[PDB]
C-alpha cells in the first residue's frame, strides 16, 4: 500500500552508490539506455547523468527490521544530492 | 641502506600456497599484501561491503 | 557525546555491567562465530 | 572486537546482531556527527 | 547514641512514607514530610530502653485506589531475623486479608529465611530490606533519572507500534535496588525519563526480567 | 508563523501516535527551543532586520541543512564509535 511508508523518502548515500555502480555496470556491458546522452564513452558519466535525471528502471527493497520489506521507487525517492 | 629500488614491489596474481589458496609473502617470491584485521574492520566502518567482499573472497580464494 | 553515550549505553544495555572481556562476551549469547572471532576460539565453538 | 556488530536500521533506531534495540535514535538525536556544529545559546545565563 | 538512633528511626519512617507515596499508596502529607522534632514528640526520643522501640512505628497503608490490597511493615527486635519470627509474621498475614508485607532487618538476613521467602512469595508477596538502603533514598539523586512503571495496555501498544518484542527490548535486572525500591516483579516494563545533554529529554524503555 | 511552520516542518519520528509525537518533540526539543530563541521577533525586528525573501529563503536553507543533517540508516555506527573512541586514546598519553 501507499500509506505504510515508515522509512524516510530521502534516499541515502549507500543507496545512490549501489544504484550508481550497478547502473554503470549494465551500461558498461551494453544494456539499452533511455536517458539522452550528449556523447560519452564511460559508464560512470552515463550512470551519473541517469541518476541526476532520476529515471532509473530499478526499485529498492528495504528490509525493515521486523522482517517485512518495503519497496521504494527512484521516481518517488527524493534525492539528497 | 633504505633504498627505493630495494623497497618497491607489486604483485598481480602470482603463486598460491599448498595449504591455502592465498598469495605469497615477501617480495622475493613476489608476495601478496596482508589485508589485515584492523584494516578489514576500518573498511567495515567505511561501509564498502562489496569492495571488502571482493577483496576477501574472490580476489583471495574463491 | 553521540559516540560516547552510545558506547556507555551499549555497555549497560544488558541489565548489568559489561566489562570488555572474554568473561563477559562469552556469557552474552551474541553469536558463536562472534565468540570464535574473539580471542578465545576453540572453547567457544566447542561449547556451541 | 567488542562492538563489531552495532548499526542503525531503517527505522532510525540502534539494533545489534541480536536486533535488540539499544537507542531509539542515533545518539538520542538522529543527527550526523559531521553535520553537528558548536553553538552558543543566548537563552541560558542572562538575567530575567 | 540515643539521638543517633532516634534520628535514624525518624529518617526510616520518612523514607518509608516517601517510598509508599512513590509506589502509589495513600500517604498523608504530614507523614510524607513531618519534622524530626514532631516525630520525637510523637514517640519519645528514646528508642534505647524506652517507650519507643521496634515494631511500634509500623504502618498499614492502603493504596490510592482499590484499597483491598494494603502493605504493612515488620521491625523485628532481633538484628538477625529468625525464621520462627517470620513464621509468626506469616501468621499475621494469614490473620490479615492483605498479602503485601515488607521486612526491615537490622543486620544480614539469613539465607534459610531468604529461601523461605522465595518459597512463599507467590501466595503472598513479602519484600525484605536493610536499614541503610532504606535510610538513604535513591530517587533523590541527580544521577538517577525519573522512573515510571508502565502498564500492560501501554506495553501492548508500545510493542505493536515499534514492532519489537520483550527480548528485543533492553532489560534491567530484577534484583537491582531501583527495581527493589519500585517493587517490580519479573518481566514488567518501566519507562525512564532522563535529562539529555544533546536533546533535552530522552525516553528510554527497560524491562525488569 | 514562519518559525512555527518550520518547527512543524522538521521531523525525526514519523507517524501520528501520541507516543511518536512525544518522542519527536523530546528528540527535537532542544533544537526547537534554540531556533525559536534565535528567531524571536525582537531580534529579527531590531538586531537582524531581514526581508521576507531573505526570511523564507533562510527557512528553506535551514530545512535543507537539517534534511542533510539527519542520520542515514545502515551506517556502521557501532564500529564507527568504537574506532572514534579508540583514536583519541592513541593520541592521548599515559604520561600526560
From Swiss-Prot, chain A:
It is found in: Nucleus; Nucleus, Nucleolus. Keywords: Acetylation, DNA-directed RNA polymerase, Nucleus, Phosphoprotein, Transcription. The keyword Acetylation applies. GO terms for biological process: transcription by RNA polymerase I; transcription by RNA polymerase II; tRNA transcription by RNA polymerase III. The keyword Transmembrane helix does not apply. GO terms for molecular function: DNA binding; DNA-directed RNA polymerase activity. Changing residue 14 to N: In a breast cancer sample; somatic mutation. One of its GO terms (cellular component) is cytosol. Component of the RNA polymerase I (Pol I), RNA polymerase II (Pol II) and RNA polymerase III (Pol III) complexes consisting of at least 13, 12 and 17 subunits, respectively. Pol I complex consists of a ten-subunit catalytic core composed of POLR1A/RPA1, POLR1B/RPA2, POLR1C/RPAC1, POLR1D/RPAC2, POLR1H/RPA12, POLR2E/RPABC1, POLR2F/RPABC2, POLR2H/RPABC3, POLR2K/RPABC4 and POLR2L/RPABC5; a mobile stalk subunit POLR1F/RPA43 protruding from the core and additional subunits homologous to general transcription factors POLR1E/RPA49 and POLR1G/RPA34. Belongs to the archaeal Rpo6/eukaryotic RPB6 RNA polymerase subunit family. This is DNA-directed RNA polymerases I, II, and III subunit RPABC2. It comes from Homo sapiens (Human). The lineage of its organism: Eukaryota, Metazoa, Chordata, Craniata, Vertebrata.
Curated annotation (Swiss-Prot), chain B:
It comes from Homo sapiens. This is DNA-directed RNA polymerase II subunit RPB2. Belongs to the RNA polymerase beta chain family. Component of the RNA polymerase II (Pol II) core complex consisting of 12 subunits: a ten-subunit catalytic core composed of POLR2A/RPB1, POLR2B/RPB2, POLR2C/RPB3, POLR2I/RPB9, POLR2J/RPB11, POLR2E/RPABC1, POLR2F/RPABC2, POLR2H/RPABC3, POLR2K/RPABC4 and POLR2L/RPABC5 and a mobile stalk composed of two subunits POLR2D/RPB4 and POLR2G/RPB7, protruding from the core and functioning primarily in transcription initiation. Part of Pol II(G) complex, in which Pol II core associates with an additional subunit POLR2M; unlike conventional Pol II, Pol II(G) functions as a transcriptional repressor. It is found in: Nucleus. The modification N6-methyllysine is found at residue 1. The chain holds residues 1052 to 1113 of 1174 of the full protein. DNA template strand binds at residues 27, 34.
Swiss-Prot record, chain D:
Coiled coil: none annotated. The tandem heptapeptide repeats in the C-terminal domain (CTD) can be highly phosphorylated. The phosphorylation activates Pol II. Phosphorylation occurs mainly at residues 'Ser-2' and 'Ser-5' of the heptapeptide repeat and is mediated, at least, by CDK7 and CDK9. POLR2A associated with DNA is specifically phosphorylated at 'Ser-5' of the CTD by CDK7, promoting transcription initiation by triggering dissociation from DNA. Phosphorylated at 'Ser-2', Ser-5' and 'Ser-7' of the CTD by CDK9 (P-TEFb complex), promoting transcription elongation. It comes from the Eukaryota. It is found in: Nucleus; Cytoplasm; Chromosome. It is linked to Neurodevelopmental disorder with hypotonia and variable intellectual and behavioral abnormalities: An autosomal dominant neurodevelopmental disorder characterized by profound infantile-onset hypotonia, developmental delay with poor speech, delayed walking, and impaired intellectual development. Additional variable features include feeding difficulties, dysmorphic features, and visual defects. Belongs to the RNA polymerase beta' chain family. This is DNA-directed RNA polymerase II subunit RPB1. It comes from Homo sapiens. The gene is POLR2A.
UniProtKB/Swiss-Prot annotation, chain E:
There is a cross-link at residue 80 (Glycyl lysine isopeptide (Lys-Gly) (interchain with G-Cter in SUMO2)). One of its GO terms (cellular component) is nucleus. Keywords: Acetylation, DNA-directed RNA polymerase, Host-virus interaction, Isopeptide bond, Nucleus, Transcription, Ubl conjugation. It comes from the Eukaryota. InterPro entries: Arch_Rpo5/euc_Rpb5, RNA_pol_Rpb5_N, RNA_pol_Rpb5_N_sf, RNA_pol_subH/Rpb5_C, RNA_pol_subH/Rpb5_CS, RPB5-like_sf. The keyword Transmembrane does not apply. The keyword Ubl conjugation applies. HAMAP family: RNApol_Rpo5_RPB5. DNA-dependent RNA polymerase catalyzes the transcription of DNA into RNA using the four ribonucleoside triphosphates as substrates. Common component of RNA polymerases I, II and III which synthesize ribosomal RNA precursors, mRNA precursors and many functional non-coding RNAs, and small RNAs, such as 5S rRNA and tRNAs, respectively. Pol II is the central component of the basal RNA polymerase II transcription machinery. Pols are composed of mobile elements that move relative to each other. Belongs to the archaeal Rpo5/eukaryotic RPB5 RNA polymerase subunit family. This is DNA-directed RNA polymerases I, II, and III subunit RPABC1.
Amino acid at each position: 500500500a501507499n500509506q505504510k511508508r515508515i522509512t524516510t523518502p530521502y534516499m541515502t548515500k549507500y543507496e545512490r552508490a549501489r544504484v550508481l555502480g550497478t547502473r554503470a555496470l549494465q551500461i558498461a556491458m551494453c544494456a539499452p539506455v533511455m536517458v539522452e546522452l550528449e556523447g560519452e564513452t564511460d559508464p560512470l558519466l552515463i550512470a551519473m547523468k541517469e541518476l541526476k535525471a532520476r529515471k532509473i528502471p530499478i526499485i529498492i527493497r528495504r528490509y525493515l527490521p521486523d522482517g517485512s520489506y518495503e519497496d521504494w521507487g527512484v521516481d518517488e525517492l527524493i534525492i539528497s544530492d | 641502506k633504505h633504498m627505493v629500488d630495494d623497497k618497491i614491489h607489486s604483485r598481480a596474481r602470482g603463486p598460491i600456497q599448498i595449504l591455502n589458496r592465498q598469495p605469497m609473502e615477501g617480495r622475493s617470491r613476489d608476495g601478496g599484501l596482508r589485508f589485515g584485521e584492523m584494516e578489514r574492520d576500518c573498511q567495515i566502518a567505511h561501509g564498502a561491503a562489496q569492495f571488502l567482499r571482493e577483496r576477501l573472497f574472490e580476489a583471495s580464494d574463491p | 557525546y553521540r559516540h560516547l553515550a552510545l558506547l556507555c549505553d551499549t555497555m549497560t544495555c544488558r541489565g548489568h555491567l559489561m566489562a570488555i572481556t572474554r568473561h563477559g562476551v562469552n556469557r552474552q549469547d551474541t553469536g558463536p562465530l562472534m565468540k570464535c572471532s574473539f580471542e578465545e576460539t576453540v572453547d567457544v565453538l566447542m561449547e556451541a | 572486537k567488542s562492538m563489531e556488530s552495532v548499526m542503525v536500521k531503517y527505522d532510525a533506531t540502534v539494533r545489534n546482531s541480536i536486533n535488540q534495540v539499544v537507542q531509539l535514535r542515533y545518539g538520542e538525536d538522529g543527527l550526523a556527527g559531521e553535520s553537528v556544529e558548536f553553538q552558543n545559546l543566548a537563552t541560558l545565563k542572562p538575567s530575567n | 547514641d540515643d539521638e543517633e538512633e532516634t534520628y535514624r528511626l525518624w529518617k526510616i519512617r520518612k523514607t518509608i512514607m516517601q517510598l509508599c507515596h512513590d509506589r502509589g499508596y495513600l500517604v498523608t502529607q504530614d507523614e510524607l514530610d513531618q519534622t524530626l522534632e514532631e516525630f520525637k514528640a510523637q514517640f519519645g526520643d528514646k528508642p534505647s530502653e524506652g517507650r519507643p522501640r521496634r515494631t511500634d512505628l509500623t504502618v498499614l497503608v492502603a493504596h490510592n485506589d482499590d484499597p483491598t490490597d494494603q502493605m504493612f511493615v515488620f521491625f523485628p527486635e532481633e538484628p538477625k531475623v529468625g525464621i520462627k519470627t517470620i513464621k509468626v509474621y506469616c501468621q499475621r498475614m494469614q490473620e490479615e486479608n492483605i498479602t503485601r508485607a515488607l521486612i526491615v532487618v537490622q543486620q544480614g538476613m539469613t539465607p534459610s529465611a531468604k529461601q523461605s521467602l522465595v518459597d512463599m512469595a507467590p501466595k503472598y508477596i513479602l519484600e525484605q530490606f536493610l536499614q541503610q538502603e532504606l535510610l538513604i533514598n535513591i530517587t533523590e539523586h541527580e544521577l538517577v533519572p525519573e522512573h515510571v512503571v508502565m502498564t500492560k495496555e501501554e506495553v501492548t501498544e508500545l510493542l505493536a507500534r515499534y514492532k519489537l518484542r520483550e527480548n528485543q527490548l533492553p532489560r534491567i535486572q530484577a534484583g537491582d535496588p531501583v527495581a527493589r525500591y519500585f517493587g517490580i516483579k519479573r518481566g514488567q516494563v518501566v519507562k525512564i525519563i532522563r535529562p539529555s545533554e544533546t536533546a533535552g529529554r530522552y525516553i528510554t524503555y527497560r524491562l525488569v526480567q | 508563523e514562519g518559525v512555527k511552520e518550520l518547527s512543524k516542518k522538521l521531523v525525526i519520528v514519523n507517524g501520528d501516535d501520541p507516543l511518536s509525537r512525544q518522542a519527536q518533540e523530546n528528540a527535537t526539543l532542544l533544537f526547537n527551543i534554540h531556533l525559536r530563541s534565535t528567531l524571536c521577533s525582537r531580534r529579527m525586528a531590531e538586531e537582524f532586520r531581514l526581508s521576507g525573501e531573505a526570511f523564507d529563503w533562510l527557512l528553506g536553507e535551514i530545512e535543507s541543512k537539517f534534511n542533510q543533517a539527519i542520520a542515514h540508516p545502515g551506517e556502521m555506527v557501532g564500529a564507527l564509535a568504537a574506532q572514534s573512541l579508540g583514536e583519541p586514546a592513541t593520541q592521548m598519553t599515559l604520561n600526560t
